[PDB]
Amino acid sequence: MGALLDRFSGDEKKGRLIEAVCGQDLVANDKDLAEQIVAAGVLQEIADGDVIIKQGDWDDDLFLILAGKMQITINGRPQTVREAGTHVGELRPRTATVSAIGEALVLRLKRTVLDEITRDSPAYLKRMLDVVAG
């Protein structure tokens, strides 16, 4: 479908999406960094049961969960569920088989593009250093 997607795509819903991105672990109300991550990434609507990540795979991809819920799973056993505002994958092959619990919207990025954004943000770099305690 695109009902969720449609709530977010186009110049029309640019604000709502940017607004959404800021309320993420990594962005932490750094707007410039979202506006960049907005441009860098591709919105995807995901059906209930739809896999964004096979585990054992080498997807450099990392998804911002903008709306809905993702069920992390390892070796057959449910782990966490990430939700609106969180992210999935990395920061080695793939840890977990992430899948969608209900309709979910994500923003998909490549490790590569991600870090050239990462690496230019004093703000993010500062925030990853603070969380580096043993």
Numbering used by the authors: 1 to 91, 98 to 140
The authors write:
3’,5’-cyclic uridine monophosphate (cUMP) and 3’,5’-cyclic cytidine monophosphate (cCMP) have been established as bacterial second messengers in the phage defense system, named pyrimidine cyclase system for anti-phage resistance (Pycsar). Until 2021, scientists reported that a group of bacterial nucleotide cyclases, which utilize UTP, and CTP to synthesize cUMP and cCMP, defend against bacteriophage infection, proving that cUMP, and cCMP are authentic second messengers controlling anti-phage defense in prokaryotes. This anti-phage system, termed pyrimidine cyclase system for antiphage resistance (Pycsar), contains a pyrimidine cyclase PycC and a receptor protein with either transmembrane domain (PycTM) or Toll/interleukin-1 receptor domain (PycTIR). Upon phage infections, produced cyclic mono-pyrimidines activates their receptors PycTM, which disrupts membrane integrity by forming transmembrane-spanning pore, or PycTIR, which deplete NAD+, leading to growth arrests and cell deaths, thus protecting the uninfected bacterial populations, a strategy called “abortive infection”. In this study, we aimed to structurally, and functionally characterize both cUMP- and cCMP-synthesizing PycC and cUMP receptor PycTIR.
The NpPycTIRCNBD crystal structure in the space group P6522 contains only one polypeptide in the asymmetric unit (from residues 1–91 and 98–140), forming a central six-stranded antiparallel β-barrel surrounded by five α-helices. The loop connecting β5 and β6 and the last ten amino acids at the C-terminus are unresolved in the NpPycTIRCNBD crystal structure owing to structural flexibility. Structural comparison of NpPycTIRCNBD with PsPycTIRCNBD shows r.m.s.d. of 1.1 and 0.9 for 116 and 117 Cα pairs, respectively. ITC results showed that both NpPycTIRCNBD and PsPycTIRCNBD bind tightly to cUMP with nanomolar affinity at a 1:1 binding stoichiometry. cUMP also showed strong binding to AhPycTIRCNBD and SmPycTIRCNBD with dissociation constant (KD) of 8.2 × 10−7 M and 2.7 × 10−7 M, demonstrating that PycTIR is a high-affinity cUMP receptor. The Pycsar system has two types of downstream effectors: PycTM and PycTIR. This study provides the structural information regarding the bacterial PycTIR in both apo and cUMP-bound states. The binding of cUMP by PycTIR is probably an example of induce-fit: cUMP induces the conformational change of the helix and promotes the dimerization of PycTIRCNBD, which subsequently strengthens the recognition of cUMP by inter-subunit contact, including the specificity-determining residue N143.
